[PDB]
Amino acid sequence: ECWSWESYLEEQKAITAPVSLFQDSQAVTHNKNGFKLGMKLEGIDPQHPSMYFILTVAEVCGYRLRLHFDGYSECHDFWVNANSPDIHPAGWFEKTGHKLQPPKGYKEEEFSWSQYLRSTRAQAAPKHLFVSPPPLGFQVGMKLEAVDRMNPSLVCVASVTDVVDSRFLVHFDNWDDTYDYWCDPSSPYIHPVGWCQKQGKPLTPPQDYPDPFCWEKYLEETGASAVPTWAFKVRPPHSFLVNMKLEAVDRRNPALIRVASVEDVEDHRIKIHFDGWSHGYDFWIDADHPDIHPAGWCSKTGHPLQPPLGPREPSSAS
Helix, strand or coil, X not given: CCCCHHHHHHXXXXXXXXXXXXXXXXXXXXXXXXXXXXXEEEEEECCEEEEEEEEEXXXXXXXXEEEEECCCCHHHCXXXXXXXXXXXXXXXXXXXXXXXXXXXXXXXXXXCHHHHHHHHCCCECCHHHCCXXXXXXXXXXXXXXXXXXCCCCCEEEEEEEEEECCEEEEEECCCCHHHCEEECCCCCCEECCCHHXXXXXXXXXXXXXCCCCCHHHHHHHHXXXXXXXXXXXXCCCCCCCCCCEEEEECCCCXXXXXXXXXXXXXXXXXXXXXXXXCHHHCEEEECCCCCEECCCHHHHHCCCCECCCCCCCCCECC
C-alpha cells in the first residue's frame, strides 16, 4: 500500500507545519511546470550569484527542473523550482544591461541567441514561463551593513550592486563577489549603516582597509550614500515549532525530497532533520528558502517523495 502523510501522522502521533507558515511561493502546488527538456534560458550561477550563464533544462521533475551550464560539466548541474526568480528568458541580460558569461568555447562578443539556437537546434523556454516593480529605497551604489552568510557571526560593510525586479544583490566591498547574495527589503541579514555601532556589535570593514574605520569617512571617500533607514523592513519571525513535519530537498542529493521534521528553530531559520536518518545530516536553513515545502507538495506537484529511512539501515537514527 502507498505511503502517505495521513497514515504517517497517525502512526507517529505527529503534526505537519501548517501551509500558512510558509511563503506563498513555497506552498503553491497548482501552477503547471511548462519547462521541457532541451529548452534554453539564462540564470544566475547559484554558487556565484553576481554572474549570468546560458542554461539548458536537463531534467524535469514535478514543479522542479535540473539546469545544465551549456558547454560545461554535468557536475555543476543544479535544481530550481519553476517559480524561481533566479532564472530569466533568452534576451533578458541584453534588455536589462547585464553581462553574460558565455558557454564554454565562446568569447563573449561571439554570442548571439539567434545564431546559438540555430547552431544547437534548440528552443528558448518561452517568456510566459518566468516570474522574473523595484524594491523601494534600494539602488545600485548604496551602502549598508550585512551578515556574511558564509561567516554568520560577522556583520560587514556592504554595497548594493544589482537590482532585479523586487530584489537586490548585496556585495561585500573589496571581497570576492562569490560572497554576494540576493535579498529583499525584509531580509533579517541586512541593516542600515551605523547599526553595529548602535548595537555594540563589531563591524567588519572592507578587506585590507587601511587602519581598521569610520562610516562617515568612507561615505565621503566614495561619495556613496547609505541605504536609507526607512527602506529596511522587519520580517516577522517565522512560526515553525519543533516536531512539526514538512518536505525538504536533500542537500547531499538535490534530486531527492524527503519527509522532514523541524529539529530546532531561530527567529528566521529552522533546522531540518530527515525522519529515520542520523542527526549527522541535520542542517539549518532559512525559513524562506525555496526548497522547503509543506506536507503534500510532492504528491500535488508530481515529484517523488522519499519516505523515512527504514529501521536498522546504515545512516539511521536510534
